[PDB]
Each structure stands twice: as C-alpha cells, then as structure tokens.
C-alpha cells in the first residue's frame, strides 16, 4: 500500500499482516492493547485523573547468555523463537503507585505459533519468573500445538528395496542408503541423523536405516517432553500466583490443555480450543463428519463447558476482562486483596429484597436492580459483581465483587429454572438435541462442580476472601443425576472448603433455605478456622422440608389426637406442617449453637463490611505471629493477639475491634517482632 | 426359639435379630469377619502356619471421662450412642509381628443408625485418635442419615389461634399456649423447649409460639452441623491415612458423602448408596416414579458410577476384600511399603507377550494367562493383581499389584472397545437406554477421571509407587467428548502426577504406542523428582501417526519427486507411511533423550524390580536427609548419598546400589545422624 499518512506498519514488518489474516492481534501490538484497556480502567475509575504515559510500561523479556531472562528493549518482530513475553509495571486504581505481571503468548507468524523445544523452555522459564516473584501470568494463546516434521535431509536420498524393480507395486522389504548416500550425509556432520546397519547383498553393501533421527531439532518426542514441562509447569503456578488466558487465536493440543490448566480463560469468539482438527478429524474417520473446528472448540462448547470462563468479542475485549479481572486480585502473592473504595459507600441499607412469592434474579440481591422509580441497591457495591463461568451450570451465579471496596468472591444461589440445550453429536446420525430442565436452589452435578471450582479459583491464586448467598434444598437425588456422579462434586466442595485460606461467610438469604444435603456441604464446621455461617431472621433450615418432617413425624395417628381441639383435614394438616416450619427458624439455628447470629437483610451490607474487615485484619496479626513463633495453634495466636486489645475494647465489635487495630499497626508490629526472643530450641 | 445347641445370641441381644431383618451383620459381630478374613488371608498365603487366636486382637474403643478415646472391655449390646469402633491389632502376611487400624460402625439397631450429634462428635474422635497414630480408618456405613425430630414435648399443649371455632376448615393466624401449657413446661424445667410472646386478646392472655426448640437434642439443623464435621474429617482423613469405607447397609445422606470422601469403598451388593430415598422422592415428585432406592444407590449406579471401587456378594466378602486390599498398604502413614515375597520370584523372563494382530486382554500383560499348555507369567508375581474401579470406565484397568513382593500401583490401558450400556431415567418418559462405543487406546472423560483418580487413590493413604503401561493414541478430540469436558479431567492427570511422592515408571508397552495428547499428560518432566519413562524397544510414539505425520510433511508433491526411484500410488504410499513410523522409534526417543531407557519386554519384569528397589532404597535415604538437613534441594541431596556409594559401585547398577545400600542401612544411618552438626542458624 502506498501513500499512508503514517509508517506503513505491515510492511515494516509482513509477520503484522500474517498475524492479521490468521484472524488475530500481532504478539508485539498486544502491550499496546493492555496500555488502552488500562487506560479505559482510569477512565471508569476515575473521568477526571490525567494520565501520564509512564503510567504504564511494557519491557519485553528474553534469555541472556546464561538463559536468564533480563528485560531487553529491543526492536518489534525480532524474536529468535516462536514465544514471547514482556514484564507490565502498570499504575491502576487498586494500585496507584504501580502493579507487576508478566504476558507470555505464541508468535502465530512464527512456524504457524508451535510449541517447541525452545518455545518450552522459555515459556517454562517465563513461568518460573512470575512465580519466583509472585506476580500474575497471563498467557495469551494463539498457536499450533507441538511442532512436528521429519528428516528432510533424509528424503532426497533414501532407497527402497524392493521385490522386483519390475513390479514395484508388488512392495518391498526395508529402505536404505548407498555409500554414496552415507558420504553425504558425513560431510555435513548429519551422520546422526539416522541409525543403520551395513549388509552386502548379492548386489552391493547397502546400509539398512533402522531408525531416523533427524538433524533439526524439534520433529516429533523431543516436542511433547517439552509440552509435559509447560503443562506441570501451569499445573503449579495455579496454586502459586494468579492464572489466566486469553484464547486470541487458534489453541491447540497442548495449547489446548494449557488453558484449562491455567483454570481462568477468556475465548475471543470464534477461536477454537482443541485437540486434534476436524480436518483430521474427518480423515481419521474417514467420512465428513465435522465442518470446522468452531463445532470441536468454539465458545458453544468450551463457554457452555465450563473450560472458558467468559467470551469476548475481540481480543481488545478480552484484554480488558483480564484487567477488570485482575483489579480484585493482589499485587502479588500473599499481599493484602486490593481494596478500592467507590462512591457506594459501606454505610447504606440494602435496598433489593427478595419476595416468597416474586420471581427475582439473585444478581438483584448482589449488585442491586435498575427500577423505574430510580437504582435499588443490593448488597454488594454497586457496578462491582464480576460475573463468571456464566455460560455453565447457570444453577448458581459465580463472580467478584466489593464490600464497601473489600473484594471478595461471591456464589450466589439461580432460583429460576435453567434450560439447559444440549447440541447433537454430528458424528451419530441418532444424535438428537436434549433439553435439561434444571429446577432451582437445587445442586446437580454440574452446579456442585462449578461451586466446587469458583471456591477453588477464589483460593488459588487470588487469593480472595469469600460469602456464599447458600440456598440449596438439597443435591439432586434423582437417578440421571446420582449416576452422573452427583456425589463426587459434591464432595469437591467439602475439598475445596478444607482447602480455603481466607476468611469465609456462609448466609442464608432472606426467602432462602438451606436443607440436609447442602447444609452437610457448607458447614463451618467443615473450617473453622476461616468460616463462619449467618442465617437471615426470614431464611429457613432443617434436616427435611416441612413436609417431609410431617410425614414422618407426624403421622395421622397423631393428626388425629390433635383433632382433639376442635373433613377437617385440608387444615390440620397445615397446622402441622406449621408445626414443622416452627423448627427451622433462624432463632432454632442460634439456640442451637449452628450459627454466629441471626441478621436482618437490610442491614447485611452493613454488618458484613465491618465484620469482614475486622476478620482481614485479625488475620494479618494472626499470620504475622505464624511467621514468628512456630508452634502454637490457631487459638493460641489469637488469644494472644485479642489480649493485646485494650482492656475497654470490646472483642465482639467488629468495626471497634478493625478500628483499633488499623491506628496500631506499627505498635502491634514492635509486639509482634518483639517476640522474636521467641528461639525456643 | 427353644432347645438351641448353644447359648441363643438373638435373645442375649434381640438387636442381633434386627440388624439381621434389616439385611446387615449385627455391628458386634463384625470383629469377628475380621478375624475369619485375617484367618484365610494366612490360609492363602501359607497352608501350613498354625494359628492362635492371639494372632488377631479386637479392643473396643469408647470415650472416658475426658471424651478420651481408651480400649474398655465390656459385654456387646452396650453402646450409649449409635456409633462404635474397635481397635485392631493383626499379624498378617505382610506384618507378622502385628498391623492396626481401627474400625468405625453405625449400629443399624440403635435409632435405625441415625447420624446424632453424639454419633458425629464420635466419628470425628475416633477418625483423629487414627489419623494422629497413622493407622487406617476403616468405616462399615448401615445408617438412615441425620436424625430428626421435633418437639415432641410440645404437640400435646400447643393451642391453635383459629378465625372462628366454628368454621375451623376456614384456617387459622398462630399457634400458642395456655398460661396452663406454660406451666408444665416450667414443671419439667423444659422451659426453653419454645420461644413465645405474651399477648393479651380480648378472650385471655396467649403465649403465641414464634419458634421451637425443643428440650431434646438432634431434632435438626444440630445435626446437620455434626454431619458437616465429619464430612470434613473424611475428607482431611483422605490425604492422611488409608480409608476405605464398606456399605454393609443402607448408607444415606451424610452417610452417602462419607462413602464418597473416604473415596475407596466397597458396596455389598443390594445395599444402596443414597441421598434421598426413592419413597420421598416419589412423593415430592407427587407421581410413583422409583420403586426401589436401589435404582437411585444401587451397584448399577454406583459401581459403574465409580463411587464404589468394588461389589461384594456379603459382608464377609466384604471384609475380605478390605483385607485383601490392605495387603498393599503400610502398616501406618510414612513407613515402608509392606514387601511381600510369593513363590514367583522376580528372576523369570515375562511369558507373555502382545502382537499387533491379534486382541489381547492387557491384564494378561500384568498377571499373566491360563492357556492349555501352562500358565504364561505376566510382568507382575502371580496372583497378585487386585483390580479396582472395574465396573467404570473399563477404557483403562487400575490395580494393585506386586512385582517380586514389591507392592504397587498399576495402570494398563484396554485395548478392546468398550460397549457402555446407559439405562434410562425413569423419571423421563422420553428417556431411552443408550450405548456408547469407547474405542480402546483413547482416553475419554471418564478414562481421564479415572486414571487422575487411580493415582490420587494411590498416592493418599496407600503411598504406593506405580507403574503405568502408558498405551492410549490421545485424547478423544470429538465434539461429544470435548463437550463433556475431557479437557479438565485430563489436567485432573497432570495434577495428580505433580502431587504423586513415591517412585513412578512410565512404560510403553510392546505393541503399545503413545500419542500427542497422551504423551503430554504423562510425561516425566511433569514431575521430575518421581517420574521416569521408558519405551519398549517394540513401542512407538510421536506427536502424530504415520498416517497424520505423510499426510502433512510428505504430500503428494513431495511424493512425487520420490518417484524418482523408479499407478504406483499403492506401494509410494506405503513408503512414505514406513517413512515416518521410522522416526517414532524408541531409538529416537532415546536419542533425542526423552526416556531412560528402551526395554525388552522379556526381560521388563527383571529391570524394573531392581530399579524400582534401588530407588525405593534412595528415596529412604533421601528423607532422612530432608528431615535431617533442611534447607537443600533434591540435587543436592541424592548427590551427597551418591557420594557415600563405594568408588568401585556403579551408580548406574541398579542391583549393586540397592545391595550396597541394605548392606549399610545402619552404617549409613550413623552417617545421617552425624550431620546432625548441621544446624545452621
Ligand atoms: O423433606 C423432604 C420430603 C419428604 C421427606 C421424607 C418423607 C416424605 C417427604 C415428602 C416430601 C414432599 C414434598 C417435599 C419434600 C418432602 N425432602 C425430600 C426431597 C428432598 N429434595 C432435596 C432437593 C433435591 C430433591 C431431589 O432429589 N430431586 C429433585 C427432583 O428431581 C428428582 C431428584 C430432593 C428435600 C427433603
Ligand atoms: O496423526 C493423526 C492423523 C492426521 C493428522 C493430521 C492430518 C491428517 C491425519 C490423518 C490421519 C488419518 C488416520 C489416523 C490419524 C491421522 N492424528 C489425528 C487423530 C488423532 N486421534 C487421537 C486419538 C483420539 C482421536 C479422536 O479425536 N477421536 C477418536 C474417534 O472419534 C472422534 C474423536 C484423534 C491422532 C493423531
């Protein structure tokens, strides 16, 4: 193209275009799309800040002599292997001063974007990078899978023995190669290259090639032990620091695996997650099963599975859904969750409330509803709910939100019956579509799964603290659900439960309940050290429905020496049944002891925030002295850090107890480090 | 019954008779099945030793004053709560001198084995006092779930407020008590059985019943509580100590996910394993849908399901096979794989052997075959397979097994199709059964999940090392499977391998091959401190298959100026086809270093006992360290026990380091414990 008002920027560089035709950004120009999407970040924050370009900074990475890598700055498309990666230092709202994370993502123009050796290594060493420093690796995936190939300086020169050079067709018995071949291959040192064996035959010696080797590296094995390296390499950096990627193109084979492995993934629509290609797919089966890979790996299969977390419509989109993901996450492993405090200030009654006989969208109850008598607010801080894996088990509603600016994760119960449409198998002509009605405040095994997952990948990584609006009656019992294995995601959930690092709040809603198989599930007990259960005053609860406990514990026989104050059924059975639901009642809960306390929904938002607060700072002091002393369990750290309390404090206020501690950091760390004569040997 | 032999037991205990109505073993009666188990474990193992009934101790454990768990000899019958337990002592085969664990019931006769507060708080004791001395916890599930009630105290005083006596039918607003009512309540000082306010209506003043409580305790959310915790315990035990859990009865609820957590379990056959029984389900359902809970838990559901690892004809089968299944185990968490030595000694060629043209039952490979002409050796001692999980996912055999006494984890791939027969939902009258075709050498969602679960399985609890014959072409990259999500449970693989802490060998077998997919999720570099990989010298692997590797590097082009070397397209097409399956040689990968070394499936059985020794023997050696030194990476530590190793040792000679090293345990042992000068400050 000629006469362009700027530099000609696919020319400067043709791979620009390639990358273009294959349908996605160019590897150099994504820094730039980060800067754009950190700057939209501003711009919602914050309409009026002016922002400096130093406000953001991209240095790119490579190895050195040593294979350390160091941050080079160096000119655009000059990558030696097909991987790249760069070290952002971003300023952002939750981090003013600035906030670090590495981008490792494929060259697509180089060797079509394959894993080799060499792309292993550095992607293994990037990895190691972040997680040495804790800081968050986004991948972003646009390749071919392993590379592959054969011996090429071996194709001109092999020879093939046959049964007869007459008739070829009739086959033959073992390829070779003449002294002549051999001497060829000597004189560039490619004698490695193959494995045979000399044998004179009445004709002449002809050398019998038992193996081919190859000179060029990265044909066949030697790619796929570098794909394990990466895979366990992801595997671990999942529980290390925090995990995403961006499927911007094409992601194959290990590519494919090493999206689910990082768990968080955004698919730009239309880019492919797979295993083997319909293509060869197709020749594999012989017939055209498959018209393209969109049917294998497109967001109708990976975003309905569960595999891709959220969609995009273009990688600038994708880009920005990482950025907003990552602004509830730590600067880096272990640092305090990053608070940003908005114009939704914590000090407000929870407008939106639930009615035993409306249909309503728990989102409402998290992120408030839009009426037309103005904005109703919910419990979380408006505009915050960052919904995730939206496009699977639609039976619960997973996402980050604010506190009064406080992150945290939130699972929330979908009351509303989910139609969940199956697609046919194209490769069985008696494949019909399927539609499963999935009822709510029910756990199936899919729902179990994503709960299961969502705690897990609030833990992980994140590192975030966690409520759960729990409102089950129950996992579904049925036969098509207890044979899909129902019980081990349900038992995911006790793992991950067990497995969680930061303060957890259970709370049954205000028309919400909770029943034997999903309490069992979810409580406290299951964590005492990081939960705590909260029962709204209108939230019900027990071993059974009313319904069920009539009919087991109140059988007609006693139905009828109830007669005995005053056919007559149709009401005596609902004072019976009133009976029951007199048992599970919140005011039973704390009797009993099951609960911390009974709340009233309009004034959760409230409670909530100080109780959260209060809890991440006693948790800051708690681990503080676990880095210190040594052995002491949990109750005795804490006992020993509320006795540091002043004496009028009073241990159960909350926003008292935050309060103090915040304006004694320091005086609390003198203590704190003043147990250091804590050498007990 | 009269004129009985001996002393009637149905009568000394009439609750002997119930568990017998109810389809169980009398609880007290199942030390017994122990004994008898243990009995013919040695009858098996040597005909000839002479047995005492010292040999097998039985101490029933109950809680103290303290609630302290202590071994009390009392008469059977006796127990205050629903739950016992028993503490083990048995010599056995593999621990002559003694082996415990302990042994944790529901008493089906004691409130139909309901889960109560009492119940769960001795469930959770007694799986700690095992977890803390490292035994196994073995639990026998017969029980109704938690336990319900209400407060029976106040149906025969509570007064219901109508809207007039005289049309009752025209409901009522609340129900209360008399200032009569109240006073029985305070009689009995079953005073905060019920939550009231006292109202003054125009007739006289009623105590209007805002909640009940009840005076007894475990009518709800109580036990829901107590389930939770045990859930939680189970599910801590797990990745503690081995668990396994037999479902000698019917097991419901909380007693269904206890099954689950403790993940091995074995399922007596028409002993259902259920959330909410079939009755129940029907009614909410208001149509007879179910007719027996068997359809919803029985081993048609949970065998194939995967929830129960094996099915037992009885009880007593049951036993045995728990037995049988511990043989494998150490006798308690960090010791020594129990070593086992049988007639099958390990200097012996491995008999039989696979073709590629001719179907084979891979468990041939691994115990070995009956024919006409003799018995063929496989890789493992004889008789020493134990197969788990066989009624699901057939696509891989998981085992295990011993190789010349060496106790360990097996994974074989079945190469023959599987036909998975799905029945229908009898709740869908649109349900039909369906069949799928599970091609063999593929994994499959449920393959991939159950081979992640094997290794999981094998490595809690068990510590077991393993070996896998890795054999499978890839992952199934079909719409179907890919929808099914295969991607997660084949990452499920990969996070199990990084976890794995005892010695893994990956071997290609003689006919097998690995395959793109499949390579990758086993690779050694996964976990290079356990893994190692080998090739049979008769294996292949590549990232692709011939076909795959012609149809894209050798195209018709390229084929073309091959044909000069002599349509012919039948017999060129077979050239370049042998062309490329010359590289997937093990040669190559032993070339381009991917695995250890190529094998010779004759002589495997020899190679891998001494090699698996010899590292079981360094791995010893290389704790001691750790728990020794402190701060010192793997390297570093195998380096300094290597160092010890006699100059003229070859450390490549796995028989010579493993005899070295058993001939010094206690030279060596001094050597660690002179390091003890190793307190770096
Ligand atoms: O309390 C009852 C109950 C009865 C219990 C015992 C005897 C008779 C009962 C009758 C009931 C009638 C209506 C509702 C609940 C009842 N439960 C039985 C049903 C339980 N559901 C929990 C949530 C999932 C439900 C389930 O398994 N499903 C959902 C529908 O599809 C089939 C499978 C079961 C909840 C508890
Ligand atoms: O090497 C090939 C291959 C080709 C590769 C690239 C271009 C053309 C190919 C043609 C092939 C033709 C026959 C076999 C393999 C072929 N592979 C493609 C198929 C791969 N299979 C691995 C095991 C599972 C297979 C799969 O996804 N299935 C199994 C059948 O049901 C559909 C889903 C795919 C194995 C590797």
Same mark, same amino acid.
């Given at each position: 193209?000629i ?12 791979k ?8 996605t ?23 009026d ?5 130093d406000?953001?900074?991209?240095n ?6 040593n ?15 097909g ?43 990037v990895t ?14 646009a ?5 592959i190939?054969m011996?090429?300086?071996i ?49 002449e ?39 995403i ?7 194959? /084979? ?5 999206? *689910? !492995? =990082?768990?968080?993934?955004?698919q +730009?629509? &239309? ?18 099963v ?8 497109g967001?109708?299969i990976?975003?309905?599975?569960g ?28 640092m ?18 639930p ?12 992120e ?6 103005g ?19 639609? /039976? ?5 939100? *604010? !506190? =009064?600016g406080?992150?945290?994760? +939130?699972? &929330?119960?979908?009351?509303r ?6 697609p ?25 799964f ?8 609030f833990?992980?990584?994140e ?24 019980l ?16 957890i ?5 205000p ?9 069992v599930?979810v ?6 050290d ?15 429905e009313?319904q ?25 059975g ?56 040594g ?18 404090v009073?241990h159960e206020?909350?926003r ?19 147990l ?6």
């Amino acid at each position: 193209p000629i006469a362009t008002p700027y530099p000609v920027k696919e020319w400067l560089q043709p791979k620009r275009y390639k990358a273009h035709l294959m349908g996605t950004t160019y590897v150099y120009d994504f820094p730039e799309l980060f800067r754009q999407a950190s700057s939209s970040q501003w711009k919602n924050f914050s309409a009026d800040v002016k922002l400096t370009d130093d406000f953001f900074i991209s240095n790119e990475l490579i190895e050195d002599e040593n294979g350390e890598l160091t941050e080079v700055e160096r000119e655009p498309g000059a990558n030696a292997i097909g991987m790249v990666a760069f070290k952002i230092t971003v300023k952002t709202p939750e981090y003013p001063r600035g906030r670090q994370f590495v981008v490792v993502a494929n060259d697509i123009t180089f060797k079509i974007g394959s894993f080799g050796p060499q792309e292993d290594e550095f992607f293994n060493k990037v990895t190691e990078y972040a997680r040495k420093r804790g800081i968050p690796r986004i991948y972003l995936a646009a390749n071919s899978g392993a590379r592959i190939g054969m011996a090429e300086e071996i194709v001109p020169l092999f020879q093939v023995a046959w049964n007869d050079a007459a008739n070829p067709d009739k086959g033959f018995q073992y390829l070779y190669l003449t002294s002549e071949g051999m001497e060829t291959l000597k004189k560039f040192d490619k004698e490695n290259s193959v494995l045979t064996e000399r044998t004179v035959i009445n004709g002449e010696e002809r050398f019998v090639i038992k193996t081919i080797i190859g000179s060029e590296d990265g044909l066949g094995v030697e790619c796929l032990r570098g794909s394990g390296l990466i895979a366990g390499a992801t595997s671990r950096a999942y529980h290390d620091i925090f995990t995403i990627t961006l499927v911007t193109c094409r992601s194959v /084979g290990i590519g494919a695996y090493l999206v *689910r !492995l =990082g768990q968080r993934a955004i698919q +730009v629509e &239309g880019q492919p997650i797979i295993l083997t290609g319909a293509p060869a797919i197709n020749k594999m089966l012989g017939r055209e099963v498959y018209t393209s890979n969109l049917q294998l790996g497109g967001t109708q299969i990976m975003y309905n599975n569960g595999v891709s977390h959220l969609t995009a419509v273009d990688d600038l989109a994708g880009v920005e859904k990482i950025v907003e993901w990552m602004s509830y996450v730590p600067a880096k492993r272990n640092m305090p969750v990053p608070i940003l405090e908005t114009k939704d200030t914590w000090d407000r009654p929870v407008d939106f409330t639930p009615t035993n006989d409306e249909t309503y969208d728990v989102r409402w109850m998290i992120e408030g509803r839009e009426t037309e008598s103005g904005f109703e607010y919910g419990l979380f801080d408006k505009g915050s709910f960052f919904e995730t894996l939206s496009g699977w088990a639609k /039976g619960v509603v997973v996402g980050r939100a *604010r !506190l =009064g600016g406080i992150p945290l994760g +939130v699972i &929330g119960v979908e009351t509303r019956t989910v139609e969940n449409l199956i697609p046919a198998d194209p490769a069985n002509p008696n494949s019909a579509e399927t539609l499963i009605q999935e009822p709510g405040q029910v756990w199936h095994p899919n729902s179990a799964f994503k709960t299961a997952q969502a705690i897990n990948d609030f833990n992980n990584g994140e590192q975030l603290p966690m409520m759960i609006l729990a409102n089950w009656r129950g996992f579904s019992g049925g036969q098509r659900d207890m044979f899909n294995e129902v019980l081990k995601y349900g038992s995911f959930i006790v793992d991950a439960l067990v497995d969680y690092k930061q303060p957890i709040i259970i709370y049954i809603p205000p028309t919400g309940e909770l029943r034997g198989g999903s309490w069992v599930v979810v409580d406290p007990t299951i964590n005492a050290d990081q939960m705590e259960m909260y029962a709204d005053v209108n939230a019900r609860a027990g071993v059974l429905e009313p319904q069920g406990m009539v009919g087991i514990k109140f059988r007609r026989e006693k139905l009828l020496d109830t007669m005995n104050r005053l056919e007559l059924l149709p009401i005596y059975g609902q004072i019976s049944l009133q009976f029951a639901d007199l048992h599970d009642r919140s005011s039973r809960m704390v009797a009993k002891g099951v609960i911390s306390k009974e709340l009233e929904w309009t004034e959760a938002r409230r409670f909530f925030f100080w109780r959260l607060r209060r809890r991440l700072n006693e948790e800051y002091l708690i681990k503080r002295l676990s880095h210190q002393v040594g052995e002491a369990s949990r109750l005795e750290k804490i006992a020993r850090i509320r006795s540091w309390y002043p004496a009028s404090v009073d241990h159960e206020d909350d926003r008292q107890v935050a309060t103090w501690i915040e304006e004694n950091y320091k005086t609390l760390d003198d203590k704190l480090k003043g147990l250091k004569l804590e050498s007990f040997a």
